[PDB]
Amino acid sequence: GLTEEQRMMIRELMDAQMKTFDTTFSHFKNFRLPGAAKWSQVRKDLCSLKVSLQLRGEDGSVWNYKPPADSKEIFSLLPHMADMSTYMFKGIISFAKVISYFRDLPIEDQISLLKGAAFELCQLRFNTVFNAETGTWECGRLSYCLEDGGFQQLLLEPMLKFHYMLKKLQLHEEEYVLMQAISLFSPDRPGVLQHRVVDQLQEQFAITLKSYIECNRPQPAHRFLFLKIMAMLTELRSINAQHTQRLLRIQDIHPFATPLMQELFGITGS
Numbered sequence: 001g002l003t004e005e006q007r008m009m010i011r012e013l014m015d016a017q018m019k020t021f022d023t024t025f026s027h028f029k030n031f032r033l034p035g036a037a038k039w040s041q042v043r044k045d046l047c048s049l050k051v052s053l054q055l056r057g058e059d060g061s062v063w064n065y066k067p068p069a070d071s072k073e074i075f076s077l078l079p080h081m082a083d084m085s086t087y088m089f090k091g092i093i094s095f096a097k098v099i100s101y102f103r104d105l106p107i108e109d110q111i112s113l114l115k116g117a118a119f120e121l122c123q124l125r126f127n128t129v130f131n132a133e134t135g136t137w138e139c140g141r142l143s144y145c146l147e148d149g150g151f152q153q154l155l156l157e158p159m160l161k162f163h164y165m166l167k168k169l170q171l172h173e174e175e176y177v178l179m180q181a182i183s184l185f186s187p188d189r190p191g192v193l194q195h196r197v198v199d200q201l202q203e204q205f206a207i208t209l210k211s212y213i214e215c216n217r218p219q220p221a222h223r224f225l226f227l228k229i230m231a232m233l234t235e236l237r238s239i240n241a242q243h244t245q246r247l248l249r250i251q252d253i254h255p256f257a258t259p260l261m262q263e264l265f266g267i268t269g270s
């Protein structure tokens, strides 16, 4: 069983998630849509995603967008993705701010922790709207569908393999929100000062997750689930570092980051 404190911890996380995760994306509006050796790398960077976009109007109409092939056209999706990322990042910041364990840290460590983890928490939330059968992220009236190598070739992209592998674990809402907490409270992000406090908090969240899995998932399929989840969080941190470098290269060639994104990625405006 869980202790009273562990149940309180989960309930506080679940409450924060429900208050700040707009799962239907109803308040995502007014977003933009698609109308030397540095460049080869930036081309390789931009070619790894490849999603088409679908927008279902409230009246029943459907707009569909199919991206081009790399023949400047590789940048046509960046303003839209910047708007989606900014919307998600806002939700993530709200999440952190309604959690008492986070509100209790000094403001400087709050900022450091958010800068370190915003990408990761975004990816964790996107996994809950990922449909692994159709290869699509279902964000309310918006859908992002992976373009057609096959599934095996898709799994070569680490973010995509991450989404398929994590979806396969069939986690509960409580396990997702504890993964978000373990990621947010990482004592080893640059600029963290209360390293010991954050480390103890993280360990508590991880113990709560371990005990929750033990008390509620006895089936042979969920043997080692806790260790699988922690390995996924390690892999997600790696993905975060490579995507940060990728974003900074693209931003160096073709600026696109919003002010919130610039703040989170350490871009100063100078």
Ligand SMILES: CC(C)(C)c1nc(-c2cccc(NS(=O)(=O)c3c(F)cccc3F)c2F)c(-c2ccnc(N)n2)s1
Pocket: 049, 051, 081, 082, 084, 085, 119, 122, 123, 126, 137, 144, 243, 244, 246, 247, 261
């Ligand atoms: C909706 C769906 C299909 C799940 C996506 N989410 C992101 C995504 C996920 C998390 C954060 C950001 N924004 S971001 O700021 O983290 C960032 C970029 F917007 C662009 C490049 C790297 C990067 F880290 C994203 F764009 C996608 C995405 C698109 C292009 N590049 C990258 N790295 N991610 S695709």
